[PDB]
Design a protein around this ligand. Structure first.
Ligand SMILES: O=C(O)/C=C/C(=O)NNC(=O)c1cnccc1Cc1ccccc1
Ligand code: NI
Length: 431
């Protein structure tokens, strides 16, 4: 059957060195006990001014409410997207918002600083065994942390090695920089194989349940480290104890599409196709080059769904932690309407009377896939935030479908449903 090893077993410490050397442990003793408290501070400071939320994620086509409660803290303007769920940062006091909360954040920045030293240190020693040093620093340049909290007393049975009950099931970490590390700080409050009452992080090789898996006991204060490509070659998971448990997992998030600066400049590029002397509801474009015309209709989709729909779907939760994204999400919504107008503008032009059908159809082909995907995704977002696991959530937890308007709204140039604006266009393209 399936086997697993812990410190209790003799094979454990030699299995660790042969098939998981890129996993690293640092027990509570490698950390000042004053840092220890001013991290155990905010785990609860943040815990009960209630900043941590269970996410309504998507896995394998089905909508789930995750056991673990979470919060993204980190670099300002940064997002981290796992499971088609874009998390936005409660921000750090980084170089260049309530009083206690903002202290919590500054703290995990200090923690972050510390780990990122320790990560580099151990990455050098790791590298000093297999025989640039700016590769090493980037892969430790953590830009976010995802805090996780679970109280076991409120779980699935670990299938392959009988490891017991799982807070988090066997997975790989998403949206990480390639070969970048992760540093976990682990805070626990208070026999054949592993102790059920203490928390473990489990480890397995990918595609492989024949090799026995590792079950690392994590006590109050212990940090572990997934180094380089180990996250890629290895699956991991979390084994639940009997007590509550907090964890700060520090990541190098792949935000090349993930930074406010990013989505903003995307918008700006999309609006270069606009006569922009005045902000009003009669959008006039500067080109109808089918190339330019898809790029903006694509940026329209990107800002809509990867940002607005994502933000508002986990409706109202940050207003608790910070208002940081408020103005920006307003501004992004603003830019988004102008693009609803740009869309309109393109539609009015494709049935304008002296337009040669030859590149009217070039224009259709240019924008069609975009307006389709805007429907597919509009349906899916409509459906997923009024599915009724979704309204079982309480007052300020509701999935808001924003933005949204209906037929009886002439403040919007276009309908929410585009079903046969779309079909209407491909009829042309066949006839
Ligand atoms: O608390 C720990 O020490 C371990 C935490 C942990 O492994 N978290 N995992 C993630 O944050 C994560 C990142 N990218 C994709 C998925 C996940 C976790 C996950 C997997 C399956 C269901 C819910 C959450
Ligand atoms: Ni993980």
């Amino acid at each position: 059957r399936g086997s697993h090893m812990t410190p209790k077993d003799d094979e454990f410490y030699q299995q660790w060195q042969l098939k998981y050397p890129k996993l690293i442990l640092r027990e509570a003793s490698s950390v000042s006990e004053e840092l220890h408290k001013e991290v155990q501070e905010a785990f609860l400071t943040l815990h009960k001014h209630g900043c941590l939320f269970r996410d309504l994620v998507r896995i394998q086509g089905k909508d789930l409410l995750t056991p673990v409660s979470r919060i993204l803290i980190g670099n300002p303007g940064c997002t981290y997207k796992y499971l088609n769920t874009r998390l936005f940062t409660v921000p750090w006091p980084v170089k260049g918002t309530e009083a206690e909360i903002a202290a919590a954040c500054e703290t995990f920045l200090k923690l972050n600083d510390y780990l990122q030293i320790e990560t580099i240190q151990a990455l050098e020693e790791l590298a000093a065994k297999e025989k640039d040093e700016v590769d090493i620093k980037s892969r430790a340049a953590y830009n976010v942390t995802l805090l996780n909290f679970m109280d076991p007393q409120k779980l699935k049975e670990e299938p392959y090695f009988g490891m017991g009950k799982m807070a988090v099931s066997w997975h790989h970490d998403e949206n990480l920089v390639d070969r970048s590390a992760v540093a976990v700080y682990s805070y626990s409050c208070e026999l054949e194989g592993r102790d059920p009452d203490i928390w473990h992080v489990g480890f397995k090789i990918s595609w492989d349940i024949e090799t026995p898996g590792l079950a690392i006991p994590l006590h109050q204060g212990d940090c572990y480290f997934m180094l380089d490509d180990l996250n890629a070659t290895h699956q991991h998971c979390v084994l639940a104890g009997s007590q509550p448990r907090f964890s700060s997992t520090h990541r190098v998030a792949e935000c090349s599409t993930g930074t406010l600066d990013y989505i903003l400049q995307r918008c700006q590029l999309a609006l270069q196709n606009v006569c922009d002397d005045v902000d009003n509801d009669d959008v006039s474009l500067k080109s109808f080059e089918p190339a330019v015309l898809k790029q903006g209709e694509e940026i329209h989709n990107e800002v809509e769904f990867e940002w607005l729909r994502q933000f508002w779907f986990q409706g109202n939760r940050y207003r608790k932690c910070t208002d940081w994204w408020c103005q920006p999400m307003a501004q992004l919504e603003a830019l988004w309407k102008k693009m609803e107008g740009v869309t309109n503008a393109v539609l009015h032009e494709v049935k304008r009377e002296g337009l040669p059908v030859e590149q009217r159809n070039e224009i259709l082909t240019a924008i069609l896939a975009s307006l389709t995907a805007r429907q597919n995704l509009r349906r899916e977002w409509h459906a997923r935030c009024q599915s009724r696991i979704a309204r079982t959530l309480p007052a300020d937890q509701k999935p808001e479908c924003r933005p949204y308007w209906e037929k009886d709204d002439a403040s919007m140039p276009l309908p929410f449903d585009l079903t046969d604006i779309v079909s209407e266009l491909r009829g042309q393209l066949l006839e």
